[PDB]
Design a binder for these strands. Structure first.
Ligand SMILES: [Mg+2]
Ligand SMILES: [Zn+2]
Lengths: 515, 316, 140
RNA sequence: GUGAGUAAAAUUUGG
RNA sequence: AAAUCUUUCUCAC
């Protein structure tokens, strides 16, 4: 059906591929590809372009954002049992906490300052040293990245060490800053549509548009290229350490460590890789490896090809193409005048993943579609009604609900099928507020979040420091006694007003109800 | 006094020397890029013909035939499914069926192209039942017009091998279709073709979570007229059926590899392209090596057939 | 002994950000296991039961949107809507009332939302999410 | 239904 | 048996 669309359609209406296949084969194939590239027989990994035009940030103070260093996402932590190295899958929060415990540092900034201000590599920072930190930070674990539309055979992604994550965060922040300084297209506040619009404005003058993707992007970004860029922008010892770890990185496949001298392991440094090209020329609008350029004559095209080759941006001959009337970037397709190309485009379907969260996601998708002119509003209303009917078919059974209130959705035992316009204008029962895209999280969302918080990799017996005062800074240090005092005070306050749990706060509703 | 990002440590020179001693990449060859027109109808026809010649077609539609009523009432369907489970010697425990395995051939199953049934009125019910059964496996589950049976597949060890499936246990999904193929099963005067599908939990969840009706409605908003097609996906105006397109959509829902998405992305590029790379853009349509199995292979074949039909009926 | 000692072994003081990161239970992720998780032990059923008699009769009844202007289709553009953050005094008062302190603190930061729109009016006014086609204006 | 161990225990699966 | 190295664990209360 995607083939018979009048306009542009990417066929995203279904979910991406998935399977229980082990990640061993994909990771091994990626490592072998990187090794072959290192030999110089498949693709270019030697950077020749000049990056002297990039500004130097060496004088900027060393600043670290603590929030980016803690997350529920996975990471690899290295321990020593009896001489051998053991790589354990944990959460980035737990990995960073273990690193701080080992180094006896109260914050990542203290750790990085200590690392940068040691006399030698053998000097001990807590229970470790910079030499041991560099040795441990070169270990990566492998996993499968599934649900990637257009990739029937899934790719391998990699979990890194917390120390690697710290240094990577510093260098990537500075690389993003340099990218923002280079061109206004790389501003922090710019969506994919805005970047496509700016690209359309940039390339309108010339005749032909080259829409290019790169082949094996991460495997052709060598540690030498990263070091070149980092020295160009002035990262100093942090960049040197990161390049050293990247060169000596090893990937755990099943139960064996495999050396991977080449590549950067699937998007470890997106901004630095982008700078590798952006720092050599200006007639390219690129993000990661998706780029667009414009030209008039074959000589300009040859110059473009030479520029791409010199920056280790190997053009993908299977996807890159030349257009005259369309402009494709970030999966967004526009006309040369900047208008959105007619058709579904990149519109994606909403799978059944909960009676209420599914409706909220469908409402968000339909709002995005109608606002951008993909479809008329009445079509969105009809589709929302159909989705409500399908949700009622899937979920209106005793397994999910025992209620029969009239205001409830038909999928929860009620008899209400609200209109899309009624929901978007808040002209609905308050139970439907959670179905609004800007409304609070749905019941199923909170249930799933709590259950996820209770998983093996995330479960902890620690006492939660929740419902905190909005004047206490998070950089403030605290002991167990402090936690007990704050929790007791908050509990007493809640008991002093007749409550046992804090009331969920929605900023949109609060502002709307304000006199 | 405040440490700067460009701060130079005492070990900087040592690490730089170590990096110098470490290996470096060799210069890669410069590629010669030739720009030519995108592929014509003949290239897609050749790809489809190569797939057809290499793999061939199954006699019946197998599980894809489960999208149509089997002609049996609910009680007959339940009886037939339970007696099929008994006939295959599936273990019975706690009122549920379990399939036991001891040894594996470690060879991929034979894969051929499934012919298209006439229609798929029960696509929604089939997807809902697939979603429901794999989380409620063991017993026969019914819908308004069809029923299926999800049987956990667990190893046979001995007296105490395994009683309940775990998060990684696979399921054999068994469904009924009208008789008339090698998979017929007869019991107490009731006849029906029994078709099975071996799915791991992730594939089952992916298949069951798709919204067939909403996807069909969304596709119809800005869609050109669909030609009638034959059992093999060829343009057959005299005797073809348009409803087969629905079946194709159902196949896309059943295919957990979603190779049709790759074909669709490449076809979008093709439709937007004025010039492409010689001999390399065309290879983007050769996705047989990327997948394995009857369902993914059939989905890829029919996606290529859809591209061919679009180029034939509504040239761009 | 104490869980604090086991978790942050070797350190008697940790930043509040680090301490809170260990007890995050509000992050939702869309995954294939949603249906199985929601069915297991009737967790969603119990959650709906609890919501319908402990949380639903606390939501304020906000008014519906009324203002709307005539609009017409136009070239795709980016609409920037600026949502100011809570004031310090308002946040302190709201915390004193008994609202979730984490959410109250989260609303202090000023927000900018960039959304693509393909509709415009004679006055070039900004529209509510999902209602640019009908023309519901922020009027702020 | 509670916790604990394993290069993993399903928010799995990273930038 | 099949979409075939996958259909998987142990211990205490
Ligand atoms: Mg690429
Ligand atoms: Zn058959």
């Amino acid at each position: 059906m995607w083939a018979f669309q009048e306009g542009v359609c990417k066929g995203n209406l279904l979910s991406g591929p998935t399977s229980m296949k082990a990640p061993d084969s994909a990771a091994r194939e990626s490592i072998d590809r990187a090794s072959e590239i290192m030999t110089g027989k498949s693709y270019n990994a030697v950077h020749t372009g000049d990056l002297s035009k990039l500004p130097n940030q060496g004088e900027s103070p060393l600043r670290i954002v603590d929030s980016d260093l803690y997350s529920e996402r996975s990471c690899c932590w290295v321990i020593e049992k009896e001489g051998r190295v053991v790589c354990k899958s944990t959460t980035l929060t737990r990995g960073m906490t273990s690193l701080l415990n080992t180094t006896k540092c109260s914050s990542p900034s203290e750790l990085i300052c200590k690392v940068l201000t040691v006399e030698s590599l053998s000097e001990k920072i807590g229970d470790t040293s910079v030499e041991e930190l560099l040795s441990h930070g070169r270990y990566f674990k492998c996993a499968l990245r599934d649900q990637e539309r257009g990739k029937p055979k899934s790719r391998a992604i990699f979990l890194s060490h917390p120390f690697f994550r710290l240094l990577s965060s510093v260098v990537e922040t500075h690389a993003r800053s340099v990218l923002s300084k280079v061109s206004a297209v790389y501003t922090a506040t710019a969506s994919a549509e805005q970047r496509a619009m700016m690209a359309a404005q940039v390339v309108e003058s010339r005749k032909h548009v080259l829409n290019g993707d790169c082949t094996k992007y991460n495997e052709a970004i060598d540690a030498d290229t990263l070091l070149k860029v980092w020295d160009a922008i002035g990262m100093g010892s942090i960049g040197v350490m990161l390049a050293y770890m990247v060169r000596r990185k090893c990937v755990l496949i099943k139960d064996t460590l495999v050396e991977c001298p080449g590549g950067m392991l699937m998007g470890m440094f997106n901004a630095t890789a982008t700078l590798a090209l952006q720092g050599t020329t200006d007639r390219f609008l690129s993000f990661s490896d998706d780029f667009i350029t414009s030209f008039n004559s074959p000589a300009e095209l040859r110059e473009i090809e030479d520029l791409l080759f010199a920056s280790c941006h190997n053009l993908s001959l299977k996807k890159s193409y030349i257009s005259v009337a369309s402009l494709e970037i970030n999966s967004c397709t526009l006309t040369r005048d900047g208008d959105l190309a007619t058709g579904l485009g990149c519109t994606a379907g909403v799978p059944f993943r909960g009676p209420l969260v599914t409706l909220k996601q469908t409402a968000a998708m339909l709002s995005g579609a109608v606002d951008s002119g993909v479809m008329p509003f009445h079509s969105a209303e009809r589709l929302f009604q159909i989705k409500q009917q399908e949700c009622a078919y899937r979920y209106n059974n005793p397994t999910y609900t025992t209620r029969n209130e009239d205001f409830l959705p038909t999928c929860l035992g009620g008899k209400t099928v609200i209109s899309f316009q009624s929901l978007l204008t808040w002209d609905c029962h308050p139970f439907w507020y959670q179905v609004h895209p800007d409304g609070p999280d749905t019941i199923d969302q909170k249930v799933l979040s709590v259950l996820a918080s209770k998983t093996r990799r995330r479960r902890t017996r620690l006492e939660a420091l929740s419902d905190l005062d909005p004047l206490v800074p998070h950089r403030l240090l605290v002991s167990e006694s402090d936690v007990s005092k704050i929790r007791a005070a908050r509990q007493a306050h809640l008991k002093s007003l007749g409550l046992e749990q804090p009331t969920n706060f929605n900023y949109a509703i609060y502002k709307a109800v304000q006199p | 006094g405040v440490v700067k990002v460009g701060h130079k440590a005492s070990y900087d020179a040592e690490l730089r020397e170590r990096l110098l001693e470490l290996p470096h990449p060799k210069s890669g060859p410069k590629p010669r890029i030739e720009w030519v027109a995108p592929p014509r109808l003949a290239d897609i026809s050749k790809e489809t013909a190569e797939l057809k010649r290499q793999y061939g077609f199954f006699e019946c539609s197998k599980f894809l035939a489960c999208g149509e009523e089997c002609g049996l009432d609910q009680e007959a369907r339940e009886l037939i499914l339970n007696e099929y489970a008994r006939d295959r010697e599936f273990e019975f425990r706690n009122g549920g069926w379990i399939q036991r395995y001891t040894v594996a051939s470690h060879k991929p199953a034979t894969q051929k192209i499934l012919p298209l049934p006439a229609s798929a009125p029960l696509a929604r019910e089939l997807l809902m039942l697939i979603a429901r059964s794999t989380t409620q496996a063991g017993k026969v589950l019914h819908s308004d017009n069809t029923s299926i049976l999800a049987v956990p597949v667990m190893r046979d060890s001995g007296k105490h091998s395994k009683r309940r499936p775990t998060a990684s246990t696979h399921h054999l999904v068994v469904g009924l279709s009208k008789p008339g193929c090698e998979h017929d099963f007869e019991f107490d005067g009731y006849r029906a073709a029994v078709h099975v599908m071996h799915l791991d939990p992730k594939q089952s969840a992916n298949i069951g979570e798709q919204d067939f009706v909403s996807t069909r409605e969304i596709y119809k908003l800005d869609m050109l007229e669909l030609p009638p097609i034959s059992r093999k996906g060829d343009l057959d105006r005299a005797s073809g059926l348009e409803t087969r397109w629905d079946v194709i959509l159902l196949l896309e829902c059943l295919d957990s590899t979603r190779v049709s998405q790759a074909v669709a992305q490449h076809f979008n590029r093709h439709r937007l392209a004025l010039s492409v790379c010689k001999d390399e853009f065309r290879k983007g349509y050769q996705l047989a090596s990327e997948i394995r199995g009857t369902i993914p292979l059939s989905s890829l074949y029919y996606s290529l057939c859809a591209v061919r039909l679009r180029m034939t009926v509504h040239p761009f | 002994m104490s869980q604090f000692g086991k978790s942050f072994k070797g350190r008697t003081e940790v930043t509040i950000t680090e301490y809170r990161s260990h007890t995050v239970k509000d992050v939702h992720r869309s995954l294939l296991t949603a249906d199985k998780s929601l069915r297991k032990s009737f967790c969603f059923r119990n959650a709906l039961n609890q919501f319908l008699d402990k949380d639903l009769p606390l939501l304020p009844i906000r008014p519906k949107l009324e203002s709307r202007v005539a609009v017409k289709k136009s070239k795709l553009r980016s609409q920037l809507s600026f949502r100011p953050g809570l004031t310090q005094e308002e946040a302190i008062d709201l915390y004193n009332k008994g609202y979730d302190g984490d959410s109250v603190s989260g609303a202090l930061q000023d927000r900018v939302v960039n959304e693509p729109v393909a509709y415009s009016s004679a006055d070039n006014d900004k529209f509510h999410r999902g209602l640019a086609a009908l023309g519901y204006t922020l009027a702020d």
